[PDB]
């Protein structure tokens, strides 16, 4: 399959090459797998999540996205236009309130949440996790991504927007989880993205176009746009039997498009998410 006009970073995903706007997919597009979006929820009613996103959890008032920066991150997992696994099912968990903040306790419960709830769905083809989140190293933040992986979810989580070395950010810093850094269209290291070792993999960040509160679309950057295109990609490939939930993200590195990014830091894998579809 074929999306004309796509935004630049899935367009990005499926070439060898910076400066495309073609996203070449599978028709399979995730179906049957499930990805859960913890964040500040998910404007489920958005047209662009076509019946195929529900909020399944609130640590807040309401369920409701007062946001925008969860229903964005939702749309590049898996929104009809914007989205790298266009036919996956979204799961909302709101961590994080209408400012986009949360404390590190209730995002340590939604993940033992995600770890838990995945028994009551159907996801035949697997579930993935996209934590676009995180702040300082945290030792019981880095545990429940290590336990929501270890529960059978592939986890992705953000590498942070600081400019510096993810060993000090969490959940970025866990090992067991797919910590991704942020690219922009020109094939570099995007301006914010944490970089390091404990990196596995890059994705694009800067100036991704996805969903937005209101019914409405917009661009933004971060390593928390660069982390749903992961997901929804791990959620694909899993979908196409290529992977599991636990090898995906050794998977995506390995399959990735290599050496193809500037300003990467010695230590750093220069890796850029790639969907390697041969139609
Ligand atoms: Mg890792
Ligand atoms: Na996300
Ligand atoms: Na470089």
């Given at each position: 399959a074929a999306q004309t006009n796509a935004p630049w970073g899935l367009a990005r995903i499926s070439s060898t090459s910076p400066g495309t706007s073609t996203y070449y997919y599978d028709?399979?597009?995730?179906?049957?797998?499930?990805?859960?979006?913890?964040?500040?929820?998910?404007?489920?009613?958005?047209?662009?999540?076509?019946?195929?996103?529900?909020?399944?959890?609130?640590?807040?008032?309401?369920?409701?996205?007062?946001?925008?920066?969860?229903?964005?991150?939702?749309?590049?997992?898996?929104?009809?236009?914007?989205?790298?696994?266009?036919?996956?099912?979204?799961?909302?968990?709101?961590?994080?309130?209408?400012?986009?903040?949360?404390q590190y306790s209730t995002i340590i419960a939604g993940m033992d949440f995600v770890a838990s709830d995945k028994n009551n769905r159907n996801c035949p083809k697997g579930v993935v996790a996209s934590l676009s989140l995180g702040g300082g190293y945290s030792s019981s933040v880095n545990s429940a991504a290590a336990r929501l992986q270890s529960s059978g979810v592939m986890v992705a989580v953000a590498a942070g927007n600081n400019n510096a070395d993810a060993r000090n950010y969490s959940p970025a810093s866990e090992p067991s989880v797919c910590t991704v850094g942020a690219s922009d269209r020109y094939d570099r290291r995007s301006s914010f993205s944490n970089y390091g070792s404990v990196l596995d993999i890059f994705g694009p960040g800067t100036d991704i176009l996805s969903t937005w509160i209101g019914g409405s679309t917009r661009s933004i950057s971060g390593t928390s746009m660069a982390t749903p295109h992961v997901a929804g990609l791990a959620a694909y490939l899993m979908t196409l039997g290529k992977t599991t939930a636990a090898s995906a993200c050794r998977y995506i590195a390995d399959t990735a498009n290599k050496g193809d990014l500037s300003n990467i830091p010695f230590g750093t894998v220069n890796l850029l998410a790639y969907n390697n579809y041969q139609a």
């Open positions: 028709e399979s597009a995730g179906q049957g797998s499930c990805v859960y979006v913890i964040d500040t929820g998910i404007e489920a009613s958005h047209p662009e999540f076509e019946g195929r996103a529900q909020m399944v959890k609130t640590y807040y008032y309401s369920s409701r996205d007062g946001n925008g920066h969860g229903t964005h991150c939702a749309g590049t997992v898996g929104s009809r236009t914007y989205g790298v696994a266009k036919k996956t099912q979204l799961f909302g968990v709101k961590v994080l309130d209408d400012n986009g903040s949360g």
